[PDB]
Amino acid sequence: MVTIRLARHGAKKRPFYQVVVADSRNARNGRFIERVGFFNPIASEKEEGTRLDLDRIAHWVGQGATISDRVAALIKEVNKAA
Amino acid sequence: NIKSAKKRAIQSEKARKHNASRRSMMRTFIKKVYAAIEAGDKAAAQKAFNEMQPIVDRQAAKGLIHKNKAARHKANLTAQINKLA
Amino acid sequence: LSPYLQEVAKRRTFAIISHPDAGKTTITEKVLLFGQAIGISITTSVMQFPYHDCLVNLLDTPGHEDFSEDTYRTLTAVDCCLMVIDAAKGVEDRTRKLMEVTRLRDTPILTFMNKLDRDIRDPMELLDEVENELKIGCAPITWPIGCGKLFKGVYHLYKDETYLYQSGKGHTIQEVRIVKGLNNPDLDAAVGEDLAQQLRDELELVKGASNEFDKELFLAGEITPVFFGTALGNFGVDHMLDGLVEWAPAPMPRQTDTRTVEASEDKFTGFVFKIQANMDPKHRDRVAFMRVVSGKYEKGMKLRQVRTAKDVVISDALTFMAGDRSHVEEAYPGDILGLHNHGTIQIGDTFTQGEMMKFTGIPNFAPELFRRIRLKDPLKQKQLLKGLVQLSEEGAVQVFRPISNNDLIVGAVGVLQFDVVVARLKSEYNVEAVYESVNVATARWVECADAKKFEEFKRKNESQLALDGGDNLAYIATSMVNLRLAQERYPDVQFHQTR
Amino acid sequence: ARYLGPKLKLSRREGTDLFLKSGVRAIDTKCKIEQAPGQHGARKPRLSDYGVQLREKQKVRRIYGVLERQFRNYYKEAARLKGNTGENLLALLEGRLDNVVYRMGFGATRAEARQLVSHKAIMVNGRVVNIASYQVSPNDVVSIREKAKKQSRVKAALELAEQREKPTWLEVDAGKMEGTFKRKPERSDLSADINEHLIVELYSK
RNA sequence: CUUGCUUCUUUGCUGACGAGUGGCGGACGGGUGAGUAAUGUCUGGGAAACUGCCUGAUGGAGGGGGAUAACUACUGGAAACGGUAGCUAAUACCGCAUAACGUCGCAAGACCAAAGAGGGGGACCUUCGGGCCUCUUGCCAUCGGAUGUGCCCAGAUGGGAUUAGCUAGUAGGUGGGGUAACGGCUCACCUAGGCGACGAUCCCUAGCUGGUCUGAGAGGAUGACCAGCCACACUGGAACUGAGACACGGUCCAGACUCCUACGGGAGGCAGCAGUGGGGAAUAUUGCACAAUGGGCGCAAGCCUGAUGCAGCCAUGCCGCGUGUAUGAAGAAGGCCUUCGGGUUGUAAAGUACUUUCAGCGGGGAGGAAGGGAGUAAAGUUAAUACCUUUGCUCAUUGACGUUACCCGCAGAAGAAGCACCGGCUAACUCCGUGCCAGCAGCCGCGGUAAUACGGAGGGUGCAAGCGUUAAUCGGAAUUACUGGG
C-alpha cells in the first residue's frame, strides 16, 4: 500500500519533515519512490515556509495513495482558492 | 514460547487435515484418470474427466489451487484423452 | 472504618534477637511451616508470610558480639522484640547488650525459652536470674514437665488448655490430642501422678509469687511475658502465633526532626537500613530494606531522594515472599521491600514526597583496623577493585585505599573477617588474600573540612593521605599521637561521621 | 579560548606593535620594545624561511586574536572564495564582529571590544550577538542597546577613535553610537604592513 | 425503617467486558554480520509471474445443511495439559441455483463464488422474532493502476599457481511431474558434452553498496553511526497456516546447556530494549510516555509500540563561553641567575574603581499541538427538517521532556586552568645534584666530575577543558612509477 507521509529528518529539537510517497511497510527514513515538496514546522514567517507540488500529489491520488492526517492538513493549508 | 496469539498455531492444525484432505481427494480423482490412461478405455477416460473437472475447479476456487496448476492438469489431461481417442 | 487502616492493624513486626547458639534459624524454619510457606549465622532474611489472620513480618540478624551491628539499626525498624534464652547459657553479656539496646526505645518483649530437649534448671531459679540480672519483671503462663527428657506437655493458665507432646516431629506437621481439664486424674495417669503434683505445686508457686498480665504496661515493656517449648519438636512454637496476634499492637510512629509520623499519613518514610552482603547469581542490587509503615504502595510511584533532593522513579519493588525474591508486587503498609540500587543510596538515606527532614537513626560504630589486601594470584585485580567497593558502602566493611596503590585495608568493626574471605569465592570474586599480622591501629576518624582550609592540609603531608570507600580522606591512623597532632592542626569542619 | 595573559610581551616578541596594549594612552615606550622579547633578547636568530612564516602567522594571529584551528578554518574559508586567497583571508579576518567594533572605536583595545561584545551590549540588525566569530554581512548596522549605552566605557575609548585613521569601509554616527557597515575592504587599505604571502606559503603544505 | 431514605436476591435488558470461536496483524517496525567469493551486492536491460491491505470501472450478493469451542456431568496429571457423553451461534465450514470479456479446449462445449452487519424512520404490515425505505461499511468474480516480492542475462565486485585440471544430474535435447512463473526444479530415454591460462576446481579472508578519511588529481585503506539489499535468530533439518515465512519473541524432530518434578514428564533460548558473568586496554540506565511521527486493529472513540520523542552517565569527537576588566612602582616580599653593579619572575601580585557572561537561589515563561470530544448553523444524501459525510463556528481541553529554551531580580571576583616541550628536525635558556651509574629517546643520539639532551629549581614557548603517549589509514612516498622508476 502506497501512502504520502512525513519522514522526520533534522536534528534533535530541530525537526524538519519530508513529505514523500512511499510504501507503508518501508521505514520512515527508508526507501521511497520519489520526493515531492517539504514541510518545516519551525518555519515561522520568513522568505519560505512550505513548498508543495500539487501536480504529482494529484497524480498519486489518481493512483490510489492514502493521504495521512498531517499531509491532508498540508493540503488544507495549500488551498485551491486561498 | 508463551504467546497470546498461539491460536493461529492450532487453527492451522485445524487446517492441515481438512484442506489437505480435500487436496488428497482431488489428486486421487486425478490419479483415477491416470488409471484410464493405463486402461485404454476412452469412454471411461471421458467419464473420469467429467467427474474430476468440477471438483478440481472448486478446489481452484477455494484458494488452495491458484487456477494455473489445475489449468495445467485440465490442459495436459485433455491432450492425453483426445490423443488416446 | 476504612479497610486501609484495618489492614494497617494487620501488619506487625517481630525481628528475632538472641544469644549465640540459641536457635534463630530453626524457629524461623519452623514458622515457615506454620503458614504453609514451605561458621554460623551469616545472612539476614525477611519472611513476609502467607499467614491466615494477619501478615506479621520477620527480619533475621547474625547473633554475635563481632556480628550484630545490623541489629543496632534494625531493632529501630521493628516495633516488638522476641528474646530466645537457653538454660545452659542463661542471661549473659549478649543479652545485657541487647537489653541495653531495647531499653532506649521501650519495645514490647515476648521471650521464648528454647532447647527443651536438653537439660534445664529450675524455672523459679531462671526467672529470678532474669529478674535480677535484667532488673525487669516477668509473668509466666505455662511450664513443661519435669527435667531432662521428661518435657512432654504444656499447661496454660489464662487459656486453661493442657497439651501433650510427641517425639520425632521435626520433619512433618502433626497434631497431638487435647485434654481440657486441669484436675483430670486421667491426665495424671497419662503423664505421671507425682510429677503432675509437683507441676501443680509449681503453678501454685507461680500464682503466689508473680503478677498478672498488663496491656498499657506491655507497650513500655516493664513486665515481659515468657513462653516455653522447643524449636525442634514442632510443638512449642505453634502456640506463639496466637500471642503474636493478640499481644502486639499497631506499628508505632517513629521520630523525625520535627515530630513523630503516624501510620495513617502519606509521604512514604522508607529509608534504607542495611546494604547487606549479597549473594550474587547474576546481579547485585545491593538491597533496600525499608520502613514503609506509612502509606499504601503504588506500582508507578516516584520516590524523592531527600539527601540528594532528586525525583527518582522506582517502579520495581521486590516482596520477600517465603525468602525468595518474588515478582513486582505492591502490598499493604507495614512491610519491608527490596529495591535495585547501583551505588547511589547509603545507610539511612531518607525518603518522603516533599518533607525534606531527617530521622534519628544510624547507630553504627567506629571500626577496628585489621590487616590488608595483598592479592595472591595477582591477575585480574578488578574483581576486588569493584566488588569490594560494592561491600565498602556497608556498615560492616569500609575499604581504605592508600596512595601507594597496594596494601588496601579491609575495614572491620568486628573481629571475624572470615565473612569477606568466604565472600571472595563467588561468581565475581576469585582472589584469595590470606591473612597475616600487620599493625594499623585506630579506626581512621573520617573528616572532610570546609573549603579553602583543607587544601594546605592536603599540601603539607601529601604522602599521608588515604582514599576511603565513597571518596573520603580521614587522616591516616597509625597511632594516637598522630591524631593528637591532627587535633593540634585545627581542622574546622562541617562534620559528618559516615559511620 | 582567550589568551588573557601578557598582552604586552607579545608585541616585544613580534617586534612590531600588535595594538594589544593600545589604551587611552599613546605609544608607551615602557617595555623596551624591539630589543627585549624575553631573557635572551640580545640574541640575533638565524631567521629562516619557516621561521619568518611562523612569525608572520603568529603576528597576524595575535593581531586578530584568532587561535590556530579557527585560523585554519578561516584559511579553508579563504581558499574557497573568488579572486585570490590572500585578499579573501584578510577580508574574512576583517569580517569578524569584534574587529568591526574595534574599528568603530567602541572600546580601546581588542580584548575590551571582545568583552563589550560578549556582555550583551553590541547589537547588529536588532539581534544581539555575544560571540565575536559572527561573520559580518555587507550592508548591516551595528549599535549598542539602550540598557548598556554609554556607561563611560564606550565614551573615553571613543576619543581614541579620534586619533585613528578612521577607515573608509565603515561609518560611525558618534552621536548615538550607531555604526554602519559597507562594502568589503580593499587589500591596499588595511594596515599596509602585514604579509599574507607567508601565511599562504605556510598553509600550502 | 427518616415508606420511597437505605438494605438486598434475581435479571445480558443496557454501558461495557476475563475466557472462547472468528477476521487482521504477527513476513512491518527492532537486533547482529556468524555464514557467503557468488546462490550475495551495485550498474543496465528483460519476460515465461504473483500482489492482502489502497483505488477505478463493470455485475452479483439467491436458497439450505452439518459439526465445534466456550458452557454442562464424570474423569487422567503435581504442574504443563487434556479425554469421554450432550447443547449452540457466526463475517467459521460445506453442498444446491447462477454466471460473464474468468479456466480448459482450434472451436463446439464443460466448469467455477459469496456475508452480512451498524445508525435513523413516513405509510403499509406486525404469529407483535420484525419485514420494509435510506445511508455507511464489509464480501465474491474479472479487467486494471501503483507498490513490494519472485525469476533470467551482460559488465563490475580480495589474495594465493608453493591450487592445473574440474564435472556424472555433469553439458544439452525429447517426454512426464512440479512451482504464483521460464527453468535438470525434479524423474524415464538419447548423445558426450560443459568449464579453463581473458585463472576452471581447491585454500584463506570478507557481508555488499551509496558513502567515510586522506590525497591537487589519479589512487590507497575503510564502509562504525544514516540509508537500500542480502543472510541469521543456541546448532542442524523439515513442513503447515498465511497473498507474502520454508519464519527473532510460530510448530515438530535430533544434539548441547540451565531449572522444576509428586520424578510419570516438562519449561527455556536477550546476534531486542535494559541489566549480569567471562573476555578485553576499551564502551552506558534493570528510567519516563504514546505529548508528536510511524506501524498493527477498530467506522470512530479508544488499546499496544524498549521504533520513536526524550531523560541519566562517559571531555569519546566538534563548537562556543568563562575562570575577570581598566588602572596600579616601592619597579614591595619570596624564588632563580650574577661580573653580586644588577637583571628576571613582573602590571605579574598587593591596593583602588567597575562588571557578573557561566554556576547558586527566587519569580514569569513560549514552541515542539496537528488533532480528537460535546454543542450549533449551512450544503449534500434521502420520502424525511431523522441518521451519516464535509466546512465554518461556540465551550472544555490533550506535554514525558519540564525544577524546559528564553527573560527579570538578589548577593558577592565571589565557585571554576590545566597538559606537553625547551640540542637539531620543530616554538623556547640558565643554575644545582649525580657521573658511560642512575637515566632519556620518533631519527641524528647524550650521560666517562663544567649535561642548553637524566633528575630538581627558575624562566620561556605551544595548545587549551583539554594536553601528551600508544594503535590504525592516507599524504609526504615518483620508496610499487597507469599519470609517475630503472
Ligand SMILES: Nc1nc2c(ncn2[C@@H]2O[C@H](COP(=O)(O)OP(=O)(O)CP(=O)(O)O)[C@@H](O)[C@H]2O)c(=O)[nH]1
Ligand atoms: N534439640 C534441640 N536442639 C535445638 C533446639 N533449638 C536449637 N537447637 C540446636 O542448637 C543449635 C542452634 O542452631 P541455630 O539455629 O543456627 O542457632 P542460632 O540462634 O541461629 C545462632 P545465632 O544466634 O548466631 O543466629 C543447633 O545445633 C540446633 O540443632 C531445640 O529446640 N531442640
